[PDB]
Design a binder for this molecule. Structure first.
Ligand code: VDH
Length: 164
């Protein structure tokens, strides 16, 4: 079945709790596998220790730049970028998990969790999962964002991995 993965998130060094994500490998297997392996760290790199560096209230929480920690970096398990697998899943509401990009076919490791329906991203960002548990954690993260995306607390994925 589809993987379940987790992100354990701190804000200013104190735990907020756990976000559990279902990865829709049934729809986007290549995109799901990238995220899964970055959660386990099994390729020797991944999300552990990295940050939510861009958080915009009433929009989304973005993370996954584990190389430069500022939005310029990250990489996939396949290489520095990989294609848009499909656009079948839509940005239907809060809790959607989707790939950040720098235009078509530039998926790496950066991703975002929506806190609203973001329909204008349909056909532009690859949706690959959703929050199973821990939306309260996502709302906390969101509350530490700003219009510019700059966070007002240091939001760190302290641990991450695969549950099933
Ligand atoms: C740049 C080189 N690059 C990495 C890369 C960068 C991004 N960047 C973003 O999505 C982003 C990040 N941070 C911020 C803060 C902000 O205010 N905007 N913002 C944006 C729009 C997305 C995916 C990938 N992965 C593919 C590989 C690749 O080409």
């Amino acid at each position: 079945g589809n993987p379940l993965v987790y992100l354990d998130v701190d804000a200013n060094g104190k735990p907020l709790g756990r976000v559990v994500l279902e990865l829709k490998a049934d729809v986007v297997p290549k995109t799901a596998e990238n995220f899964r392996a970055l959660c386990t760290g099994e390729k020797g790199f991944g999300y552990k220790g990295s940050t939510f560096h861009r958080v915009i209230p009433s929009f989304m929480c973005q993370a996954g730049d584990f190389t430069n920690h500022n939005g310029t970096g990250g990489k996939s398990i396949y290489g520095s970028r990989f294609p848009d697998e499909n656009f079948t899943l839509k940005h239907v509401g809060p809790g959607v998990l989707s790939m950040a990009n720098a235009g078509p076919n530039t998926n790496g490791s950066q991703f975002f969790i929506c806190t609203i329906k973001t329909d204008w991203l349909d056909g532009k960002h690859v949706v690959f999962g959703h929050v199973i548990e821990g939306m309260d954690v996502v709302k906390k993260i969101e509350s530490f964002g700003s219009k510019s995306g700059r966070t007002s607390k240091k939001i760190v994925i302290t641990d991450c991995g695969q549950l099933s």
